[PDB]
Design a protein around this ligand. Sequence first.
Ligand SMILES: [Co+2]
Ligand code: NA
Ligand code: NA
Length: 109
Amino acid sequence: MSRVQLALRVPDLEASIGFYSKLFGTGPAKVRPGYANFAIAEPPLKLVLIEGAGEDATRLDHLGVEVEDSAQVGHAARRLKESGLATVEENDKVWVTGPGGEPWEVYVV
Ligand SMILES: [Co+2]
Ligand code: NA
Ligand code: NA
């Protein structure tokens, strides 16, 4: 259906991969320099780890909703705009930002 994407900026990518592998009982789906992600079935979650630049603590990088196909992104894009939110589309993604600055992407992988 759809799942939340949580992207964390972490000070230690390697330590974070080990921790999350244990927490969710599954290994990362993608690993490359400075980046890893996990595709978790239960709870439905795309977890993204971005290595920080000498960061002192983990912080939120961005948030999102991962959907099945482009049509769903388009539907979300139109609904969000009609609701009065300012949006930015990529062509597939739509971006909105919350009042305290937290960015959300609605996207298809
Ligand atoms: Co993302
Ligand atoms: Na979810
Ligand atoms: Na934060």
